[PDB]
Structures are given as structure tokens and as C-alpha cells.
Amino acid sequence: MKMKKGFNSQMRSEAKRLKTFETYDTFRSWTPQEMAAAGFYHTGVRLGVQCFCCSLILFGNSLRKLPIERHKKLRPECEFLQGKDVGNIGKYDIRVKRPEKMLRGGKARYHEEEARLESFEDWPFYAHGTSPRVLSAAGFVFTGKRDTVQCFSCGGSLGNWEEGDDPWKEHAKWFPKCEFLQSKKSSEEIAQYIQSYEGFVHVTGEHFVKSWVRRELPMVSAYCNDSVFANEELRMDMFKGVEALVRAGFFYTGKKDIVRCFSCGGCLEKWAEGDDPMEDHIKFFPECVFLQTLKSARSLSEQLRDNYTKATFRHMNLPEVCSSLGTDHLLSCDVSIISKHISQPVQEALTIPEVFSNLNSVMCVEGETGSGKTTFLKRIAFLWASGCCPLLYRFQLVFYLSLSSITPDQGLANIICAQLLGAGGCISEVCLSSSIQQLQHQVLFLLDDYSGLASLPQALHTLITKNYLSRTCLLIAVHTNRVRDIRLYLGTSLEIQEFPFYNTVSVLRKFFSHDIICVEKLIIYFIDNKDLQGVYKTPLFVAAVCTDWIQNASAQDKFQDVTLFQSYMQYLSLKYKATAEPLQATVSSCGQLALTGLFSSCFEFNSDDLAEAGVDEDEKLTTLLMSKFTAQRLRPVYRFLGPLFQEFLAAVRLTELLSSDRQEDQDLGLYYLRQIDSPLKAINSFNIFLYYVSSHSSSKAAPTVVSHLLQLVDSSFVSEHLLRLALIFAYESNTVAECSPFILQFLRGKTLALRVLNLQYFRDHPESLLLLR
């Protein structure tokens, strides 16, 4: 209840307000990214988080209100930029201003040291944990603005000082060529000081991506609030007075009349009189968004190709996640990563804002098939091009290349010009080779859809196999347990663990205005908790539930589980329509396995049974959309997405078998239909197998199974007859109530007790209710 409130926790900014959520459960509405962007950190008292400037006991976490709204509503006296040690992604150096420019009179006097001591009257209260004496002992002087300090005789500015950061390691790390440093400290201790988290970085205040950013006030919900990025957004199509004024909280994505604020908008036609705050952001944009954002040689060639890469990464083509229909630029939810280390099995979970700082050499990212590799690579490329995340400023060039058979060993220049630039980039082989060589650790390749060394081109092969004479940094997307070739070559392997539920609920929240469907999904989901995992193993379930809104709400209020599963399966069928032949096999071949276990009462499904089922024979991609490597001690197990998914896949296999006219691919279906042989078997199996063999409009399969249900005959006795006939009539009326019933149910099952025991659909009653009922 009561914990040490104290005061401003000066040791707590973002990128440290996010790392505190590794001890946070993955099932709740608000996200660590959004909560941390609100200046909150996870103490761990029971479940709650508190702010770093205005300590708040915020435990309850609702859905209709974002953390910014709660923080403003409860204690509104800490967000007037009165002073907060807010660090953004914050590459720790971006302050490069005045390398030799106008200081406040050169308070170091260009010689003196006690002058550096005395220049710190207005040293703010953000730091202070850092002693001004130790800062001044290394030739540092306070330039005057926002706790950034400049060192003379080399003119280097460092900011975002935190607790315990000794300004002697850092002065060595960021400027080895600082004359004062070589004058005082020997060339031996500096190598020891090099040991830090950034790989090979140097003085990189000059770089073609830079864009100075403000104090990153917490009213910045997420990216796209820098008022300079949003301006160059709409230099493409909204160019043929209105434009510059539209940047009162807007940016362009789409077809010249769909311009989006941080929530949504554009539902009005432009070029009329039309003041941009029209209808005050059209009806406040429901919930009065952010108080109107709070009241408003060949170096030339490589720079030119840098500009083209930035332009083609900011084009509307790349930033499109949740690629179903809509108008999307607002998603920033990240994927959790835990990086296994080369030698021993240590997990060591990372965070997205900190993983960028460790990019050193050839890197691989794991991940289940359809789990967010292409998205993550596109996000990092975009964030480089959308230059406001500072950590990515160290790369002068980034390249996204999908090695999906477009590369039969032809050449790197040809593959980079025809995939990224487009009709404009004539970057020659020699130009690209020289750019790679001189820009050693400032070129980041993002390779996707990996196959193997044999398929890479010559230059890419050299860059991936040596990484000694080139120093280029690469990130390759691969499949889990399918990266067995570059084990010896890579450092800092990475893996996409899972997709937590807060990301799913955040994406659901953003896409919807009628936010009663999402809450219904929340309640109707934590009551099962058996399919808690698996279903959210991939972001494709979010896309499936979103595209289920092509007809109505995703909470149709009628046995939600079967609709959810069918929506998922239909979305799988839709996405891979280009290569649907193996998927149709993967759903069938794997699906039959579930049927084999539907009645044998086993869900572990060890490896040797998979061969009998007839799936994974080629270790193919899609077979991981429906199973996971649950255990890896020995003889890895293969568990599906919960017993309910057992049921649904077994049902779809049974329907396909009893629907196919292949005679002896159907006798097996009848055999699997045979084991149900008693009313208790018509209950215990059909408690969970009821709406799954019936849901599908199995025209051919309906008569055989309804006949089998009828032929079982050869209070509790009467009761089971009543339930059995209820099942049979419901099943037969689900799809077609003409062919099978008029010749089948007229035989045996007709019973009722008082008035409404046979209140089903009304047709011609029997002669006299089976002559005995």
C-alpha cells in the first residue's frame, strides 16, 4: 500500500523506465512502451507503477483511458516542463553544438581548471548525483542548457548524465583524440575505458541523418511529434498555404485527403475555406486528444544515395504494418527479444531501445514463422530514415534487401538498385564497394527471407563470411532452429520470444472507436486461460481478429470461440493465397494428426507420431503456424494451441475427409467416426466437439454423421434421448434440413416430455410421435 515516495528519482528516465518491465506480466491492457512514455516506472510493490517527477500510486489499469490521461487527471502539477530528467532513445551524444563555436565566453578560459570548477552555479537538479567536481576534473564546462557539458581543446558535448557514470571512462570512449585526455591520462587506461555497451562508435556528431529534437515532453505519445518530420511527410503528394498550416497536429498517409493526427482524422474535404482545426479536430477526435496536443570524391555519390534511401524508406510503401485494408501509420508496439549468447545458455532479455546500442557485427534474429521479422526490419529501416531516433544516427546507410530468390548470384549493385532506389540509382559496383570500405561500421544491411550462404551474391557473401576487413554491420532474419550454417560466424544472436497480450490489446484499441468489442474479447478470453498461450504466439491473430471486422464486430456474441478460430484459419487461407498449395497441405497433413489425437486422448504428440501423420517431412515453414517447440530437453514435444484448437483442427480434418469423394480417403473418416458409440460418448466428446463438426457447411459430410448419430439405438434414458435428438436436429438444420432428415430421422429419435421438450423447428409432426412417444 504505502511505499517510499521520497521525491524526484533522478536515476530514472526512459530507456530505464522501460527495462523495469522485464518483471511485468504479459497480460494487461496498457503497454510498457506507452506507460514508460508517460514517465512511469515499475517499482514492483505489488503490481503498480509510479511516476519519476510526481510520484503517483497508480495500480488499476483501465482500457478506455490512456496513461497520459490518468496522469493528467490525478496530479496535474508536474507536466508544465518545470524540469524532468527525461531521456529519449537518446544516443547520449547528439548534443554536438559548439565544437568551436560561441561558448559563454569560454568559461574554461582555454587554460584554467578552477574556472571549470566554478562554472557550475546553475547545474540543474536532474543530476547532482553526479558531482560537479568530478565532471570539472576532466576539462568540462557547463554550456548552459539542459545538463549538457562541453569539453574544451577538443570541443565535445555530452549530456544525459546518470548516476554512477564516471566522466573519465566516457571522455575516453567518445573522443580518444582529445588533446587534454592524452595530456593527462596515459594511452593505456583509455583502452580499459573503452569497455562499454556501444560497439565501435566514435565522434559522430556529423552524419547525414541528424535532426535536432526538443526536450521530448511526455505529451509526445509516440513518434511523429517533431513538427519537422511531419512537414517532410507531405512533400510528396500534398504539393499539387494549406500545407504548412495542416501541421497543427497532422501528417499525410495515403490519398491526398486522408491526413492523420496522433489518433485519427481527415473526415472532411480540403481546399475549401476549411480552417485546419475544423469542428475542433472533428468532435474533439473522441476524448479530446491531448488537449489539442496541449494547445499546439565519391562522398557526394554516397550522400546522394543516402538521400535516395531516406526518400524511398519514407515513401508510403514501406511503413504499412497490419497490411489488411485501412489507413495505418500509428503502430509502434514492439516485439520482445531475448538474445541467447554464443557459448552458454543464458537468456538475458533485452529491450528495443537498448538493442540498437549493441549492433556490432553480423547478427541474426530468430522468430517463429509469421512472428514479426519483416516488420521489425522495416521498423528499424524506417526509424533510420525517419531520422529522429538518435541511436540509429551512427549508420550513414541502411539497406533492406529481401533475399527471396531475386538473388541468383548476379551482383550487389544491381540487386540494390532494383529493390530500393528505383529508376534513379546508378550506383556503380566500385562506388558501392568504396562506400562499404570507407564507411566501415556505418553501413547496416537488413537482410530478410534468408536461405543460405550458397544463395548470397559475391559481395554479400564476403561481408557475411569475414566481417574482418569490412566492419559492416548486418542483421539477418531467419527461422528458429533453421540458422544452422552461420552459427560459427555471428555474434549476439537474437530471438523473438512471443507476442505479449498488451501489444494485441493495444493494436485492437487503436483500430476501434466502439471500444466495447475489445473489452468483451478480454473478459471472454481470461475465463478460458487454457488457450491463453499459442493463440497469441504470433501477431497474425491480431490481424485475423481485425480483418474479422470485414462483416461486423469481432464480438458477434454467439459461441465466440469457434468464430475466433475460424477467423484465424480464414486469415491464414487469405494471406498465403499466392502460395496456398503447401498451406492447404499443411492444414490437412498436420490437421489429421489432431484427429488421431482427438479420441486417443493425447496432446503431447512426440516426434515419431508426426511422421505417421505425414507433416514436417521437409521441415517446412507453415507447420509452425499451428505448433510450437514446447519442450527441448530431449525428443522435442509438439503441442498445438490448446485443447480447443485440438478440437477445431480435428473437426476441420473430419469435415474434409467426410466431404471428399475419394473413396478410401473417406473410409478412414468413417473409421474415425466409428469410435463414438454411446450416449456418454455423444456427450463427453461433443461437450467440446459440438459446434465444430456442425459449424462448417459440410453438405456431403452431414448425412453420414447424422445417420451415425441416429443409429446409436440398436429418466436418464429419456434424458439422453432428448439431448441426442437436440444434437441431431441442430446439426441437420445447421446446413441442409431436406436430404438427410426426411429419410433418416423419421426412423427413431422423436421424444418429448411436457410441452416444449420438442420446441425445435416446426414441420409436419409424426403420425403419432413414433406410435409410443
Ligand SMILES: Nc1ncnc2c1ncn2[C@@H]1O[C@H](COP(=O)(O)OP(=O)(O)OP(=O)(O)O)[C@@H](O)[C@H]1O
Ligand atoms: N507491432 C505489431 N503490431 C501488429 N501487427 C504486427 C506487429 N508486428 C508485426 N505484425 C504483423 O506481422 C505480420 C508480418 O510478420 P512476419 O514479417 O514475421 O512474417 P514472415 O513470414 O516472417 O515474413 P518474412 O518471412 O518475409 O519475414 C504482419 O502481417 C503484421 O500484421
